[PDB]
CSV table of C-alpha atoms and ligand atoms in Angstrom, one decimal:
chain,number,residue,atom,x,y,z
A,195,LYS,CA,3.4,12.8,24.9
A,196,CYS,CA,2.7,9.6,22.8
A,197,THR,CA,2.5,5.9,23.2
A,198,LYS,CA,5.2,3.8,21.6
A,199,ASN,CA,4.2,0.3,22.7
A,200,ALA,CA,1.2,0.1,20.4
A,201,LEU,CA,1.4,-3.5,19.1
A,202,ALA,CA,1.0,-4.2,15.4
A,203,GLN,CA,-1.4,-6.9,14.4
A,204,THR,CA,0.1,-10.4,14.3
A,205,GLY,CA,-0.1,-11.6,10.7
A,206,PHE,CA,-1.1,-8.2,9.4
A,207,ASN,CA,-1.8,-8.3,5.6
A,208,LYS,CA,-0.1,-5.4,3.7
A,209,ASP,CA,-1.4,-6.3,0.3
A,210,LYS,CA,-5.0,-6.0,1.6
A,211,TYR,CA,-4.4,-2.8,3.6
A,212,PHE,CA,-2.3,-0.9,1.1
A,213,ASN,CA,-4.7,-1.5,-1.8
A,214,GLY,CA,-5.0,2.2,-2.7
A,215,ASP,CA,-8.5,2.3,-1.4
A,216,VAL,CA,-10.1,4.8,1.0
A,217,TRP,CA,-10.5,4.3,4.7
A,218,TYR,CA,-13.0,6.4,6.6
A,219,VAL,CA,-12.5,7.3,10.3
A,220,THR,CA,-15.8,6.3,11.9
A,221,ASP,CA,-14.6,6.7,15.5
A,222,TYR,CA,-11.6,8.1,17.3
A,223,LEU,CA,-10.0,8.6,20.7
A,224,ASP,CA,-7.8,11.7,21.1
A,225,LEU,CA,-5.8,11.4,24.3
A,226,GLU,CA,-4.8,15.1,24.0
A,227,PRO,CA,-7.9,17.0,23.1
A,228,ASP,CA,-7.7,20.7,22.3
A,229,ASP,CA,-9.1,23.6,24.5
A,230,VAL,CA,-11.3,24.6,21.6
A,231,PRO,CA,-13.7,21.9,20.5
A,232,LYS,CA,-13.9,21.0,16.8
A,233,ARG,CA,-16.0,18.1,15.4
A,234,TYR,CA,-13.8,16.7,12.7
A,235,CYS,CA,-13.9,14.4,9.7
A,236,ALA,CA,-11.0,12.4,8.3
A,237,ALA,CA,-10.4,9.8,5.6
A,238,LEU,CA,-7.2,8.4,4.1
A,239,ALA,CA,-6.2,6.3,1.1
A,240,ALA,CA,-3.1,4.1,1.7
A,241,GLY,CA,-1.5,2.5,-1.3
A,242,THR,CA,1.5,1.9,-3.5
A,243,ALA,CA,2.9,4.1,-6.3
A,244,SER,CA,6.1,4.3,-8.1
A,245,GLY,CA,7.5,1.5,-5.9
A,246,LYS,CA,6.8,3.1,-2.6
A,247,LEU,CA,4.2,3.0,0.1
A,248,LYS,CA,2.2,6.2,-0.1
A,249,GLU,CA,-0.6,7.5,2.2
A,250,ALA,CA,-2.9,10.5,1.4
A,251,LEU,CA,-4.8,12.2,4.3
A,252,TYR,CA,-7.9,14.3,4.3
A,253,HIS,CA,-9.4,16.4,7.1
A,254,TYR,CA,-12.6,18.3,7.0
A,255,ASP,CA,-14.3,20.6,9.4
A,256,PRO,CA,-18.0,20.6,8.8
A,257,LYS,CA,-18.6,23.8,10.8
A,258,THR,CA,-16.0,25.8,8.9
A,259,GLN,CA,-16.2,23.7,5.7
A,260,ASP,CA,-12.4,24.0,5.9
A,261,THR,CA,-10.5,21.3,4.2
A,262,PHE,CA,-6.8,20.2,4.1
A,263,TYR,CA,-4.9,17.5,2.4
A,264,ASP,CA,-1.6,15.8,3.1
A,265,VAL,CA,0.5,13.3,1.2
A,266,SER,CA,3.4,11.2,2.7
A,267,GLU,CA,5.9,8.6,1.6
A,268,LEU,CA,5.8,5.7,4.2
A,269,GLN,CA,8.7,4.0,5.8
A,270,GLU,CA,8.1,0.6,7.4
A,271,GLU,CA,9.5,0.3,10.9
A,272,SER,CA,8.1,-3.2,11.1
A,273,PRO,CA,5.1,-4.7,9.4
A,274,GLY,CA,2.1,-2.8,10.7
A,275,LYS,CA,4.3,0.0,12.1
A,276,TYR,CA,4.9,3.0,9.9
A,277,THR,CA,6.5,6.5,9.8
A,278,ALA,CA,5.0,9.2,7.5
A,279,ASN,CA,6.8,12.3,6.5
A,280,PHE,CA,3.9,14.5,5.3
A,281,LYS,CA,3.6,17.5,3.0
A,282,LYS,CA,0.5,19.6,3.0
A,283,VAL,CA,-1.0,20.0,-0.5
A,284,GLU,CA,-3.8,21.5,-2.5
A,285,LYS,CA,-6.3,18.9,-3.7
A,286,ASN,CA,-4.4,18.7,-7.0
A,287,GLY,CA,-1.0,18.0,-5.4
A,288,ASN,CA,0.3,21.5,-5.3
A,289,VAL,CA,2.6,21.8,-2.2
A,290,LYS,CA,1.5,24.3,0.5
A,291,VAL,CA,4.0,23.1,3.1
A,292,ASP,CA,7.1,21.0,2.0
A,293,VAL,CA,8.3,17.9,3.9
A,294,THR,CA,10.2,18.9,7.0
A,295,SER,CA,12.4,17.1,9.5
A,296,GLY,CA,10.3,18.1,12.6
A,297,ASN,CA,7.2,17.0,10.6
A,298,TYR,CA,6.0,13.4,10.6
A,299,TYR,CA,3.5,11.0,12.2
A,300,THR,CA,3.8,7.4,12.9
A,301,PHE,CA,1.1,4.8,13.1
A,302,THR,CA,0.5,1.2,14.0
A,303,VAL,CA,-2.1,-1.0,12.5
A,304,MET,CA,-3.4,-2.7,15.6
A,305,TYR,CA,-6.0,-4.7,13.8
A,306,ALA,CA,-7.1,-5.1,10.1
A,307,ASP,CA,-9.8,-6.7,8.1
A,308,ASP,CA,-11.1,-6.5,4.5
A,309,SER,CA,-13.6,-4.0,5.8
A,310,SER,CA,-12.2,-2.5,9.0
A,311,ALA,CA,-9.2,-1.4,11.0
A,312,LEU,CA,-7.9,0.0,14.3
A,313,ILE,CA,-4.8,2.2,14.2
A,314,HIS,CA,-2.8,4.2,16.6
A,315,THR,CA,-1.2,7.4,15.4
A,316,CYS,CA,1.3,9.8,16.8
A,317,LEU,CA,1.6,13.2,15.2
A,318,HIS,CA,4.8,15.4,15.5
A,319,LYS,CA,4.9,18.8,14.0
A,320,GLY,CA,8.0,20.7,14.7
A,321,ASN,CA,9.5,17.8,16.6
A,322,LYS,CA,7.3,17.5,19.6
A,323,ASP,CA,4.7,14.9,20.4
A,324,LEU,CA,1.2,16.3,19.7
A,325,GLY,CA,-0.4,13.4,21.4
A,326,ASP,CA,-2.0,9.9,21.0
A,327,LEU,CA,-4.8,9.3,18.6
A,328,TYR,CA,-6.7,6.0,18.2
A,329,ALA,CA,-8.9,5.5,15.2
A,330,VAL,CA,-11.5,3.0,14.0
A,331,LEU,CA,-11.4,2.8,10.2
A,332,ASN,CA,-13.8,1.2,7.8
A,333,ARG,CA,-13.9,0.9,4.0
A,334,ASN,CA,-17.5,2.1,4.3
A,335,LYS,CA,-18.2,5.5,5.9
A,336,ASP,CA,-21.6,4.3,7.2
A,337,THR,CA,-20.8,1.1,9.0
A,338,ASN,CA,-20.7,1.1,12.8
A,339,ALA,CA,-17.7,-0.7,14.3
A,340,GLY,CA,-18.0,-4.5,14.2
A,341,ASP,CA,-17.4,-7.1,16.9
A,342,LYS,CA,-13.9,-7.8,15.7
A,343,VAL,CA,-12.5,-4.2,15.8
A,344,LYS,CA,-14.2,-3.6,19.1
A,345,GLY,CA,-12.6,-6.7,20.5
A,346,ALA,CA,-9.3,-5.2,19.3
A,347,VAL,CA,-10.1,-1.9,21.1
A,348,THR,CA,-10.6,-3.9,24.3
A,349,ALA,CA,-7.5,-5.9,23.7
A,350,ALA,CA,-5.5,-2.6,23.7
A,351,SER,CA,-6.9,-1.8,27.2
A,352,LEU,CA,-9.1,1.0,25.8
A,353,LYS,CA,-12.9,1.7,26.2
A,354,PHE,CA,-14.9,2.1,23.0
A,355,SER,CA,-17.4,4.2,24.9
A,356,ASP,CA,-14.5,6.7,25.1
A,357,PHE,CA,-14.3,6.8,21.3
A,358,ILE,CA,-16.1,9.6,19.5
A,359,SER,CA,-18.2,8.9,16.5
A,360,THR,CA,-18.0,11.1,13.4
A,361,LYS,CA,-21.2,9.5,12.2
A,362,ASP,CA,-23.7,12.5,12.4
A,363,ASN,CA,-20.9,15.0,12.0
A,364,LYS,CA,-22.3,16.0,8.6
A,365,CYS,CA,-19.0,14.8,6.9
A,366,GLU,CA,-18.2,15.2,3.2
A,367,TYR,CA,-15.3,13.4,1.6
A,368,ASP,CA,-13.3,13.8,-1.7
A,369,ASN,CA,-12.3,10.3,-2.5
A,370,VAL,CA,-11.4,11.1,-6.1
A,371,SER,CA,-8.7,13.6,-5.0
A,372,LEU,CA,-7.7,11.2,-2.1
A,373,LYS,CA,-6.9,8.4,-4.5
A,374,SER,CA,-5.2,10.7,-7.1
A,375,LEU,CA,-3.0,12.3,-4.4
A,376,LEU,CA,-1.5,8.8,-4.0
A,377,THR,CA,0.8,9.4,-6.9
A,378,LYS,CA,1.8,12.9,-5.9
B,505,HEM,C1,-6.7,8.8,10.3
B,505,HEM,C2,-5.7,9.3,11.2
B,505,HEM,C3,-5.2,10.6,11.1
B,505,HEM,C4,-4.0,10.9,10.6
B,505,HEM,C5,-2.9,10.0,10.1
B,505,HEM,C6,-3.8,12.3,10.9
B,505,HEM,C7,-2.7,13.0,10.6
B,505,HEM,C8,-2.6,14.4,10.8
B,505,HEM,C9,-1.6,15.2,10.2
B,505,HEM,C10,-0.5,14.7,9.3
B,505,HEM,C11,-1.9,16.5,10.4
B,505,HEM,C12,-1.0,17.7,9.9
B,505,HEM,C13,-1.5,18.4,8.6
B,505,HEM,C14,-0.5,19.5,8.1
B,505,HEM,O1,-0.4,20.5,8.9
B,505,HEM,O2,0.1,19.4,7.0
B,505,HEM,C15,-3.1,16.5,11.2
B,505,HEM,C16,-3.7,17.7,11.7
B,505,HEM,C17,-4.9,17.7,12.4
B,505,HEM,N1,-5.7,16.6,12.7
B,505,HEM,FE1,-5.3,14.7,12.2
B,505,HEM,N2,-4.9,12.8,11.6
B,505,HEM,C18,-5.8,11.8,11.7
B,505,HEM,C19,-7.1,11.8,12.3
B,505,HEM,C20,-7.7,12.9,12.8
B,505,HEM,C21,-9.0,12.9,13.5
B,505,HEM,C22,-10.0,11.8,13.6
B,505,HEM,C23,-9.1,14.2,14.1
B,505,HEM,C24,-10.2,14.5,14.9
B,505,HEM,C25,-10.0,14.5,16.2
B,505,HEM,C26,-7.9,14.9,13.8
B,505,HEM,C27,-7.8,16.3,14.0
B,505,HEM,C28,-6.8,17.1,13.5
B,505,HEM,C29,-6.6,18.5,13.7
B,505,HEM,C30,-7.4,19.5,14.6
B,505,HEM,C31,-5.4,18.9,13.1
B,505,HEM,C32,-4.6,20.1,13.1
B,505,HEM,C33,-3.9,20.2,14.5
B,505,HEM,C34,-2.5,20.5,14.4
B,505,HEM,O3,-2.0,21.0,13.4
B,505,HEM,O4,-1.8,20.2,15.4
B,505,HEM,N3,-7.1,14.2,13.0
B,505,HEM,N4,-3.6,15.2,11.4
């Protein structure tokens, strides 16, 4: 199951966060880890297009070189708290899996900077919690978590030592497609 108490950042700035730029996941904490291990890479670009909040996701498996994209229209449940109804797409926006009722993830921006963030995400595929995931984002894929985001982790009653770093995961990102998917 998932957490639903994750508290949004007080005085969270949307304009800065949803600037249409790319966020890299430098570290994460998966409360519900799979039986089969898989060192992953992920990035996202959150922005505005056509008058709506949009988010584009990217997942990469270095080992298999497998890549998958997603694009969702966001609905604000409260500033910092969002619900995303995703659609799996080709890197050019061609839909592989349409939006579906049982399909959506929700996330909370627990802390945000000009250069870093801490989010809580809860993914549901086929209406069923798939577990809690906590991520440390950064606008730069090479920066280690700063004192501020780590304070935020602590403030949420978590342990950063429990976070896994995607640093030497041999990641590769497609920021061009990530940003362009924003309009799809
Ligand atoms: C930045 C936050 C992230 C968001 C918002 C997010 C969102 C999602 C979404 C929407 C899917 C479904 C794609 C589809 O089938 O169309 C997915 C699948 C997946 N993600 Fe993430 N994800 C994030 C971070 C990560 C990280 C860091 C890992 C590494 C632990 C991870 C591992 C996976 C795996 C293994 C799948 C497929 C599992 C399944 O289909 O149940 N994700 N993610």
